[model samples]
Target chain A: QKSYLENQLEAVAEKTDAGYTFTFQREKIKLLDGLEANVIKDINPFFHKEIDVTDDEVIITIQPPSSYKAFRFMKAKDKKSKWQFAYQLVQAVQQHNLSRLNLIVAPENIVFDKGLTPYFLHYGVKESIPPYERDEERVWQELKAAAALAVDGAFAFEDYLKFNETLTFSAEAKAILDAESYDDLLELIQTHIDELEAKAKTYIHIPRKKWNIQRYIGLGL
Target chain B: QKSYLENQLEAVAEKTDAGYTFTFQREKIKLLDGLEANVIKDINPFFHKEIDVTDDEVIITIQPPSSYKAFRFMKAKDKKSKWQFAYQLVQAVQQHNLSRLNLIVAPENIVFDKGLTPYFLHYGVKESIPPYERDEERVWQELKAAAALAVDGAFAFEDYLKFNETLTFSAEAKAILDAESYDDLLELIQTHIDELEAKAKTYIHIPRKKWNIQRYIGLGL
Candidate 1:
């Protein structure tokens, strides 16, 4: 669960006219050596078309909304933003199956541009390499954790429990708990989004995990 | 649904040291205009790494066994080859979902590199352009048709019924008919292959569609 600043150590981010470009440090290139297959195979709605593997740096160009913030720091309080996070993550897992686990699922790796469209930022990060194959059951369990964390910007479990029991849960957000599979969960969130988007405005304060909030505020960024 | 020779008109096939290369003619480039997204996104087990789109012609390289034949003409008279074809196609559908329909499903479009490894050649040749989005229900129905065709190499189809009906169906082949979804179908065939592969020696004659066989023999190629 590396944060944005934590990931910065592995790659140098360059702003481009078309989008964000990540140039991996030479040392970190080992982690991304064969991941060009991954970036192309990815079923993410906002997928990168190609990966530029130079001798010194591995470069990947992201599309649109040059300015971005990790999901952990996002001010995503509205129903659209909340549901959008859940739907996109669920859709990625649905589209990619076990391979989706290859994507960096940490909050820092999921970012949203100005349009509030969520993008899975980094690939080839989860569970490491050597044996690129990941256990199928583990992928499902991991997706469940990521999905729960996505709802209302980390409302349930860990951080939410750290504070007082006084917290709000959308019926839609809480559905992640009992959903049978990622398949079932995706349908639940996608249906909820259809209703959520129908309204002109909806508001709720989405909060980052308590530890993350403390870390960011303490850093004085 | 175009056959191998039919597709020959669209692209000139040339053998290279590593593999085969298809140099597309200018007129048919319209059919492949934006399919670079497709070739990269494909989840086929033997997926192509990159497609070279040049001003003169679009070039796509095949991985191995430069001398290849379409599934239509191959002498696939073994259980392994039969199961491999169905499993590969089923795996493709399972891995890629609706987008799998965008892959050319015709027998002429499926090729076997000398080792009997199946490859789905050519993308964006299905139900057509301007609207890249394909109909969801049509995709499911179409997959069902392809899956049934793949079993025992083109058994249980429009062509299968044309003969005198001595054609045998494996218990595994019959299961494709009742598969509730492509997800369920993939698991069924995958498990069956595990058992089928256990035996050191297995023999079965896989027949091509009567029409295709007639077409090939009639041509005397």
Candidate 2:
């Protein structure tokens, strides 16, 4: 039972001794009938070449893969739209924007769609935890915690996700992603000052040794 | 008249093929009045060695001068104060903060006193532009131009001084130096918005080719 517009292609790349090798996969080639299709290198025009799409894994070797260029193989239901989405994901990850991380690759997005799942899945990121929730109490709690954690120094978004496994962002959290620069930072900080002030007050006078012990017990146990 | 407390020693360093050669000078060395004075290497305790003082110049060859350590040839009005001032001057020049350049070695300060004059004068900066004056309108006009130029990209403070050779900051401009981040940038921008707006509007509708020709003509004439 083959559908004409099936978007079940999964692709992943692995670093080999010589260079990088990309493997392309599809459950069934519907319109083409056979596992014979084009494996296009979208990044570099000079490297554009087709490969034999087989039931077994089809591989393409990129010697010294250029970091500046992206790679794409074959087509999908919404392939073109994924380019911008993927670009945004890379940008958010590079900037280490913890608040924007969840919004970029949430499960509902095209980035985690069935065909693209393997790419992120290979990196052990099965799902992105949203940074906020619609619940009033939960949103306030998260915002305060996020703002407080940001004050400590540079916090990597990836590490934040790794530590907080169950978090998910509310649709409202998307506004935080839109904010950029110092002005934007100030606006967002002002919006959450009440919650942030309360959170700060709790940490202000707490004895460092006692706080450290409490944190240790909380994380240890 | 050989005296123990004479603080007249001045020092400067020059790069040579072998390494760095520090020259020690004094209007007159009290004890060793003929130019023979101990050229002691005080910066590195381990590398403390005295070099021969000649009539022409008391030179100490720092074979592969250690950039990590500071150098001092003899006692001064405030030898240690000059070390920190010298360090700050190097930093300001490296970063090219034109505003900071003058403040570091201004004459009112002890850095411009006899003992430390050689340290700055060796680099050809004879005096710092006075940070303020009574001419109100000119100061505002210069400040606005400087602020607008700063917004155009990474305008090094060095380049600012190079282009505006006759310009000196007013005392009010020191406020600009105090203002550091975005809040400061925005506040300053708002205060001079009229001038900034006029400057911006001038470039807005002009054709690129026409603007280029106008700039070329302005510079050529």
Candidate 3:
């Protein structure tokens, strides 16, 4: 494994108007599996810097501030081959905290990881932040309900307003209605859900109930 | 190998704001590797519709009247493969009499292909365009060139006005420099330029002779 100052990320802090800090951001690295669709909280707060892993021999650099611990992982050259590249980014940070780190997720990579351990929750709020498509029948039923609830006069309009003043829509449900009219907005929403479910399957290695980082040293902390 | 929309573009007609008839576009697929990087002038005489590519699958759907040709390139197998999956779109359009075909650089894939390219011409237009760092002496000479003749103070001033006119500056810059700061304006100008040029290299890509279509395309047109 190789590591060094990637791009001097000083400009990032500068651009954001902060002073006295510098960063070294690695060039964007595409995930070997795919990008995660939803991230509620981060166990690994990695930024998804966009880099394609489908092709090309790439050399990416990661830097440490004179001292740091390595992120370890094992890679096998071939499906049948023994895991060959067991590397660690040892002594990761020396003194200063990382000024910037970008994470990128590829769809395929997300699919792969999701395929591994699989997320068992029926629906994930983080992974599925965007609203999934409702059945057309349900949408029509909701429309009918809305129509039935409509009032007849100007006073009815005021009544409707006051009634709504005390009510709220679920963030997920409101997101569904407030979505822009893409050529196929519903389909797009569904696709977003599909992709998220795909990525979450692979991104989180252990199930939430069984996951306790301290207990698992098989894949270092 | 798979061409979906040929005459399907026939539905594409004039600009929506000003009604005109749909016309055919006539340009060969000259992939990026074959493209020239200057302000891409259309060899043919019409406006070609641009499609931003963000996915990599091998299938796509074509719609008529709208004249959209959706495409997905094949994906890369691993994180480090030689195949580049991103592609740029090229098309040709028709004018009142003749036809025009053009090539547009893909803005979405800039980080991957041709990286960042910065141009350093008009070096003296520093204050607003921000002074670029080359040799310090040159930058200093550029900074002091406040005279309209030596550096066209009016033009430089115009750039400053145009820049200030823009909402690009932060609230801090806006709040700090009111009319009262005019007396010490030069010092402020120096500080801003120093701040800008010091981080200039990060934003702009300035390699000579590197902006070309080939940087993004995967196959021959």
Candidate 4:
């Protein structure tokens, strides 16, 4: 299966603590979670590395995995730090036209570490979704909702909003909720964050009690 | 026209030299060259900045423009540098699903400085590109061609082959030439470069004398 004797190509690094790796069904993981092997390889830095593959499991080695979900970690940082992770998320998905569905965006699944940098864990992605519309629709809504949460612990959008009482949001957080299309959302993302970050007082309107229920409760711990 | 004056939002940087600026037709350039206003704002660090726009002219400021073309600069660095830039290029395009057509990728237009980071110049883009197919095809071919040139000064692909004679390439550079779809090329990219970089003997074809003609000579000053 091998044709070359390149050093770094196959040689393992000492930094890899053999014990510090993730194991999953080999079938469940492909480089970049099947976003095109190239996207994963070329932008390899963004995701955790796949170090070994056994008969049924794949192993990924990454910098010390973060104990906190990406958003939770962001909540502890400054506005600038939060947006930096947001930028990286966009950068990661851009490779190979990876739609939202191609990624496992669950806040917990996408964790962060030192420098607040994030790594997309490549296992446990859902292949069970319905059509692209509903599947994709759910993702966008979740991203928008998560964007709100990243800015404020209590951010809500879409289906979650249906469960809440009438309330409002900070102009900054509201813009993220207002995103109409994927493209539109990408644009508004920066505007709301930067403006709120600029004023240093922006928040997506109100205590999204519904989301709060989900974040620590409904959204689940 | 500004709506908010939060500190850092509209506030200028002390780093601004005022004298160090690039000015162009305001209409010809946009935040992300019109790839969707959001892409630019959300992922602004990858690009140079637009500081001012007046009467027909727009100005961008960056950390001192590179004195060399991106490919030229990469040729001088180690293998790692070459691929890092490649990763950033992919990251930038993914922002809004920006196709190659949206960017002005002339090796010269894309320059480098400081950490060898690249900043695409948004002005002087060809409004005259044929159709998306040719327009896009040319860009991909050029990218594939350039990836070749990046590793070796002489890289040939598509139409450029007409002027060249029989020759051979190292497995590394040849692989880039062999790339089929855009997706396949991205995957093969890291493989070729990493492998070449590993064995430390990769090159496109023997001399690609035809391209050498272009790089230093035919390619022009």
lDDT string for model 4 (A1-221, tens) is 32111121232222234323444454433433433222334443434454554565545565533332434546655565466556555544444243333543545446653323455544222342211122455555556665665665564323334443366666656666676866576565556455654553322222345434423432211
- In model 3, what is the error at residue A96, expressed in angstroms? 61
Cα DockQ of the candidate 4 complex: 0.02
Between prediction 1 and prediction 3, the one with superior TM-score is 1
On residues B1-221, what C-alpha lDDT tens digit does candidate 2 reach at each position?
31111222244444555644555453332334433223123222333344555666555554432322222321322322233233223322333222322222211111221111112221111121122223434333333334322233134333443454455555444444444443454445344533532443332233355434533453322
Q: What is the C-alpha RMSD of each candidate to the true structure, in Å?
A: 24.9, 28.6, 28.4, 22.8
Evaluated at residue B22, the lDDT of candidate 3 is 28
Q: Is candidate 1 or candidate 4 better by TM-score?
A: 4
Deviation from native of the Cα of residue B193 in model 1, angstroms: 52
Worst ten-residue run, lDDT, model 4 chain A? Answer: A2-11
Interface root-mean-square deviation of model 2 in angstroms is 29.1
Ranking by lDDT: 1, 4, 2, 3
Candidate 2 per-residue C-alpha lDDT over A133-217 given as tens digits, one digit per residue, 9 for 90 to 100: 2233432333333332223313433333234444554433334434444345444434443353244323223335654665575
Question: Which candidate number maximizes lDDT?
Answer: 1
- Candidate 1 residues lying further than 4 Å off, grouped into runs, are A1-77, A97-101, A111-117, A125-131, A135-138, A153-175, A186-221, B1-221
Q: What is the lDDT of residue A81 in candidate 3?
A: 12
Name every residue pair that clashes in candidate 1: none
| TM-scores for every candidate against the unseen true structure | 0.33, 0.19, 0.15, 0.34
lDDT at position B119, candidate 1? 62
> Candidate 4 docking category?
incorrect
